[PDB]
Amino acid sequence: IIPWEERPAGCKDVLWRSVANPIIPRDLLPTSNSIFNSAVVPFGDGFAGVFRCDDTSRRMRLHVGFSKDAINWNIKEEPLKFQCDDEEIGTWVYGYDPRVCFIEDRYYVTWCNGYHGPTIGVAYTFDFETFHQLENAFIPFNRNGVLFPRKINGRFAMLSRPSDNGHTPFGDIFYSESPDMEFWGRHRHVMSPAAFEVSAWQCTKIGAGPIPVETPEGWLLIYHGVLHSCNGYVYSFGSALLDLDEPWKVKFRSGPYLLAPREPYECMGDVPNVCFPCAALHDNETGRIAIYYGCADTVTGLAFGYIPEIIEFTKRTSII
Amino acid sequence: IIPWEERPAGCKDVLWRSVANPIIPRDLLPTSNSIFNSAVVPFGDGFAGVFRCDDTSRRMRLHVGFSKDAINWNIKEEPLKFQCDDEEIGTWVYGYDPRVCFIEDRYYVTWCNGYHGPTIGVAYTFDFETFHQLENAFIPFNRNGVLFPRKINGRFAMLSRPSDNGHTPFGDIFYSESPDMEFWGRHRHVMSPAAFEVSAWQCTKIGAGPIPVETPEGWLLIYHGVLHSCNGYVYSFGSALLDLDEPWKVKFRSGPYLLAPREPYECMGDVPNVCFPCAALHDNETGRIAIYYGCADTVTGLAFGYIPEIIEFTKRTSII
Amino acid sequence: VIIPWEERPAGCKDVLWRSVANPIIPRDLLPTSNSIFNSAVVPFGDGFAGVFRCDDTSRRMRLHVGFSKDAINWNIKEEPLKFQCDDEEIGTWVYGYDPRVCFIEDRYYVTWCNGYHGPTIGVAYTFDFETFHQLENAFIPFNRNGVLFPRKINGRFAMLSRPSDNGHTPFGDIFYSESPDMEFWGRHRHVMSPAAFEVSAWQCTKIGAGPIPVETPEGWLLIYHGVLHSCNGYVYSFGSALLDLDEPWKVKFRSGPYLLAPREPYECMGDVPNVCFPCAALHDNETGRIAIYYGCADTVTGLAFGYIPEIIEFTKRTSII
Amino acid sequence: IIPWEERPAGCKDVLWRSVANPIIPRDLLPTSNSIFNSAVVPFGDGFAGVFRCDDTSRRMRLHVGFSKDAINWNIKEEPLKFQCDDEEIGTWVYGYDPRVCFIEDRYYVTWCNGYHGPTIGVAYTFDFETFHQLENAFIPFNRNGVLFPRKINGRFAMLSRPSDNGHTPFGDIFYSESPDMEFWGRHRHVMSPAAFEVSAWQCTKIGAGPIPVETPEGWLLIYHGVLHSCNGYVYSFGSALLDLDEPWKVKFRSGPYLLAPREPYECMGDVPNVCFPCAALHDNETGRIAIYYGCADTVTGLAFGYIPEIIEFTKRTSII
Amino acid sequence: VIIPWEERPAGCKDVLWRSVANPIIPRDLLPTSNSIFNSAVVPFGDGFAGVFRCDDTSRRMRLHVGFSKDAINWNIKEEPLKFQCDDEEIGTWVYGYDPRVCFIEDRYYVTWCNGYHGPTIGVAYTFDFETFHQLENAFIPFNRNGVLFPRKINGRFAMLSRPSDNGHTPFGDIFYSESPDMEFWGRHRHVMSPAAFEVSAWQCTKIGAGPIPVETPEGWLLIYHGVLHSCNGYVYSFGSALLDLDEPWKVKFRSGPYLLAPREPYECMGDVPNVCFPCAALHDNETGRIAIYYGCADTVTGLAFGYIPEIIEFTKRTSII
Amino acid sequence: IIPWEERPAGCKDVLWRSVANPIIPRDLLPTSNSIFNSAVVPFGDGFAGVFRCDDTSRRMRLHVGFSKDAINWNIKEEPLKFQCDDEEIGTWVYGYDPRVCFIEDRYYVTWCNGYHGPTIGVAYTFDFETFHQLENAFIPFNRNGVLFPRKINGRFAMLSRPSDNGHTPFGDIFYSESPDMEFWGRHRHVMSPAAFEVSAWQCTKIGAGPIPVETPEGWLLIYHGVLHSCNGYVYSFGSALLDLDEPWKVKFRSGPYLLAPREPYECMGDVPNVCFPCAALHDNETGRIAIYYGCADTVTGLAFGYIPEIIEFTKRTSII
């Protein structure tokens, strides 16, 4: 059962923040500087996750966490290490902004992995104890790698985001497929930043956030968008619907954002003015969805909504 | 009858913030994201204005507002539409940072209007219901267009600010005239940013704020200045006195600011560290002035003072 | 008026062809000249007169008057041109470059990029190419490539321009504006933007008006520069468009290919490598002949020739609109 | 019958330019502006090629060409058009810097193909008349795609060069494999630019040139390297030797360049100071190699050398 | 000398901990102060003295003298300090910031970032914190974060510095220099460079010396700032290194983690958000107590406490050397 | 007996190029790529020098050379290596743009030496065979270090040029003194680039060139000046007169240049459009001076003039 808070009285918004935010504090571990941009899945009779925890050396590491209620997290103090037979791909340099999902027979994790620059690291686990590392999916520079939670016409599929070797000032979302979780291709453009005249919260760069959520009306994609002000970037997040069978085809895309930096814990911290969605839990029976997002690259927050309402919002406000 | 709060006990500042700031919140309209950098005038038995209201799509629109007390505003939910006979000029792309004044027999509105980049839009109204759009006054790129509240020597006059098509890293204030509100010329440089050693709150770029205020000795100009820190622009504002007959001739210019970002509503929000004045109401019989400014490009605040004290300060601290 | 002319080289299939005598003006024509380029030329009396940008050996930018019988061999004054002006503020000289000159109604007008707290369009007139009278700068900075039309358009003066910045400007759209009186300007309209690089990359970074627009029955023939940005800098090429006669901000045709791009050593090596920058043209409607003057590598001046009807047919055939 | 000119008397250089350079002029086609970055192979009883011919609109197109002697070229006037079933991949935006080799049963051509940015296009031909387009091999941004001329341990292999969407100011050579010329993976870093103190001609970026040349001692790689002066980039080229079985492992890499911009045809043109090798023809019986290279992004030149000499030079001056 | 102290909180495991009275110096202490931060403090007489960077409401950077009986409650002079100088050129005031003060042998020395055709390191001395005598600037521009050693090193004065540029410097190594006479400087040695980001990203963009080096039996304890560059700006944190006693350009240990990083509202909001910038320390070798003063968000001044032997241990335990 | 070529009849220029330019070809040594920006002095019966020779690896090294006439040089094939008692200072990273003069008892060499960036390296020699390295004079970043040829008031004196660690976009000339060739100080600003309205060949940055030349009226300084065009830097050179006793005080400074890039060997090369003066030889009896300058960072050229004509030109065209 997914975490949930009823929409506040009078609240007109499609998504609403948890009154318990932030749900994960920056100093949960003895050496944590910040814990954000993290992944969460159901597992056993509770929840598991892979967490981005930057330490007091400002190094970026991944940590496994477990939770009974998906809100109060027990995160391992020791960083996760990946088992790999190839010594060269097995070399840890850094890692951030994990996404996790179950595909058919095991859990997969993707992350931004350092291999002569940022690329997409891939690994699996059957038990959230031992993680086995596969080949990096792409050549650098790439980030915001997010798998589909089932095969698409019999292939693995992943969204990604060609980037550069710095604070990237552009970003289109792409789609790729693999028959075997080793060799990737059939690359297709999914979408580009909107024109600032039309939707400026998503006009500098975009990236996939949580694992795509299957609905009868398409893949529900929650994605971040950036606006470039004189004083930096503002990360907000919104919704689109992708075709079921060819998910590089965008059928609707929201004009307004779903969420943008408003609260003190979103506006002040290591990187101000950031809401960055990394994971969602949902229940199709009740339509409920709970969206985890990094706040100011410092802590982790939750927000709630109803899938049918998010669909309706995406279509009614669509800029395509 | 202008809004007013007495100088706080033992306040030695020439301007003091309203203890009720912000006076206009970001969410006054159903889809407003922010409401800031806005224009206000007396109208009838009360007040009217044109407001920059950025929506939840981060689109920039102008909305008409009305108020009985100049503090609590009733802002029309629908964006303002301009009437124009010329189809090319009457095409709306975006609009921001409006200024409004009465000149002779009607109200005039300038704003930053998109026409193949930022330039200065012009329109007039008699009633804040129908707005007749006139020719854009200049070729792009130009912003911070602010009309004088009477003709100067039989011509209309306007301050402007040549710019570029990004977050402009420079900016001098200029002055121009028009016999007819159609053709503009006799362009004169008013002032450049100060040297950083002399006055750094105004060393990167400057721009006119509220409508110039006539005094016996010249025009009181309240204007924004930017300081470029390692972590962004800080917008503060200050005062100058221009020659009455030839307003490009600056007589005094404040070394110190009048106001700079200090409170959490000025320091945190969509664009941190911004105090951007765009309107003032004044009463020559009492010397009272009330200055409306954008706060963090998020909300609108008010600050109060006396014109003769501001003039005395501007002279006594003059950097010229 | 006998305009300079060389017949198309045998075998040559280009719309324009360079003079075999290029460069026609060398960099060291005056005792202190560093470079002479980006200049203006008109018929005057039984020969030709012009206003020339001559940068000196201090690399200051100045305008000099010149006269020629044949429009090829120029006698340029050693001393810079000075403008008369009753307004001291406007009449203050900081610098000036890239002049254009045309006759409108009753006198010659000069526009140039004039320094007034940055680049703007300076404006003057002369009756005799001896005394020059300065008028208001037409626009607020930053603006350059101000080019007048050679008659009024529906009862108003008209000028092309090009909003810029205070550096090596990395953008540039051509605009059109009007004036009833050569003092106040307005009714600004956008003419064109750089093309997409996948469509026409010689003109994808920025563009600007060159020579005075040439009136044809088919519209105004605009000869204009375009910039391509390589890893090693800007390349300036030039090409042709056709503007509506009555509303010259409406572009009717615009060439895909350039007309001329830097090729010769005098275009590719010099103070600013890889520049062909058209500044003036002489034409003869009787014969269709046109002779186009252009700055070469910001160092010397060259001439190219073509036929107006061929230029027009090329612009149409290859139009990217 | 590969083209050849013997070392000049006295000449101590490992490579020497053809006395006939440039061997392809800029104006060979009726609307060619330049012909420079071009791929040549033995075909039938002569030679065939795909040529980058930028036109007088400065569009980048590829053209097929044929020659008896590999020197005097007859290049088709109309650009090459690819057959493709898939309309999305099949859409032409631009194309440059082709490379061509025979693999097993057909000729393959790669090039820098526009697909929402630069990536590596792939195609094949049996006859150099009709070309059939395959999937782009990678997600943007990537350039300098160069196939190996046989499979490596039963997979197709390709060198590439992760880039950005501008004049890329960085660049490592990578190595990737495919079982089927559709799905790519097992990406491995081959080499980075050198330290400027060590070898400044190759210290900004590098990229593969001609098709790797199999020697008993490994793959001979001819590659470009960039130096950044105050007035622009200078492209020179040099040699390395890659392990035969695992060609991302570099065995030797030359300190000095083989060739750098010196002649007027290399130092004056559309892009000054460029020698950009693009193809080679060689003879294992004689040890001779003829290297085709772009000059100033304007014309095509040829240089000659001996493979074992190049190898010994690569070893003796190795910076690894 | 009784230095300020607060005992570490119940179960706080950190090596340094903030004063519960932070900020100890507010932004509006003086009638025209905009901010007061990045300041220098020392024992003097039977209390304490300092030189404070107080930026005014014109955002000019000036230095003011202050005094305190307890080093927490400060009386800062309203009027900026003025230096007396033999040489009128060197004695010309343009601006000054980021003061450091220490006693060397027989007097107090002040260094600051002094404007002389760009930022450099000004030097002056005082016996009384009333009259200051300015000496030659120690280096040619561009340089800042000049910090003297509190005694001579093998008979010469010694200074850490930080070569810079004329803007928001995006790089920075700490250097070490010597002088026999407080006039001529030389024997320059590189001390350390920013860390690789994969190793220690709080100090990967640039570094600079903070308080005056603190002599320990295990080396000079250097407390220094590091910058990390995020998409939205620079974050300044600070940490610790140990330098060889005899040759202080040789770094023996260097911390992986920071000691302190912007966390509280007064460090994360203000004129420059996300800055903790250490400027001075007071210490007592008998108790091992150290009190470190640091600018917060370039707006106010804060204090943090620790123990010298715990910092030494932290530095060695986490060393990235 | 210094080299000399009479000013051509009719020639009105203050300096004129040797008709034998370039006097040093880029390929004089077996591994040289370029030879420019080099230092020359009288020695014994002829002349000696220290030459910047960049090799075919594009490494920057100094080499010693000798000549009978100062025109035809025999340059040692192997780079100059310094003796140094301190291993930290004695470590060679790179070196360029040497200057050489005799002071009191020996020859001193300054160059731009890499020590955690560019700074001014110092060495002496009695014989041009053995060179003894001294302390680097300054902390990085600094270049264009040029000694005075005698003590000034009992101290060694040096011009320098504060810089950054790239292609430096600014540059003022400074003056410093030393009692002992070990500790430096008394730093004084000499001059800054001119405003571009006034003298644009020297508006971006300047730096000192050859060793200053003592005259009755002051030190004659020949110095380079940069203009920044849209396509790069142009290096020209000119002249100033400094006070004899306090050489940071500038008495006269030329408006026009003396020499600017004009010939193919100045305008085409590794770095186009560079004339970079590094040395001079002069004869007070005749007023003859011969100036050595680098040409396009490729080859070395010579130019001639008369000291009294240079002095009169400098005073007559002075911008001070």
Ligand SMILES: OC[C@H]1O[C@@H](O)[C@@H](O)[C@@H](O)[C@@H]1O
């Ligand atoms: O700093 C803001 C953001 O920057 C980008 O690099 C992301 O991929 C996130 O990891 C982060 O939240």
Ligand SMILES: OC[C@H]1O[C@@H](O)[C@@H](O)[C@@H](O)[C@@H]1O
């Ligand atoms: O973002 C801060 C400021 O930016 C500029 O573009 C202004 O003209 C304002 O609209 C604004 O307040």
Ligand SMILES: OC[C@H]1O[C@@H](O)[C@@H](O)[C@@H](O)[C@@H]1O
């Ligand atoms: O330098 C190249 C070109 O630069 C621009 O500024 C033009 O307006 C011309 O003056 C010049 O030819």
Ligand SMILES: OC[C@H]1O[C@@H](O)[C@@H](O)[C@@H](O)[C@@H]1O
């Ligand atoms: O402009 C010079 C070079 O630029 C790069 O983009 C290369 O890939 C080449 O196409 C070209 O030769």
Ligand SMILES: OC[C@H]1O[C@@H](O)[C@@H](O)[C@@H](O)[C@@H]1O
């Ligand atoms: O603004 C952050 C920091 O910037 C640099 O210039 C420092 O030397 C400090 O003055 C300041 O705290």
Ligand SMILES: OC[C@H]1O[C@@H](O)[C@@H](O)[C@@H](O)[C@@H]1O
């Ligand atoms: O490249 C042009 C010039 O660049 C600078 O770094 C100089 O100090 C010279 O070495 C050189 O001639």
Ligand SMILES: [K+]
């Ligand atoms: K799509």
Ligand SMILES: [K+]
């Ligand atoms: K003025």
Ligand SMILES: [K+]
């Ligand atoms: K906003």
Ligand SMILES: [K+]
């Ligand atoms: K148009």
Ligand SMILES: [K+]
């Ligand atoms: K490798």
Ligand SMILES: [K+]
């Ligand atoms: K080309």
Ligand SMILES: [K+]
């Ligand atoms: K060290």
Ligand SMILES: [K+]
């Ligand atoms: K001076």
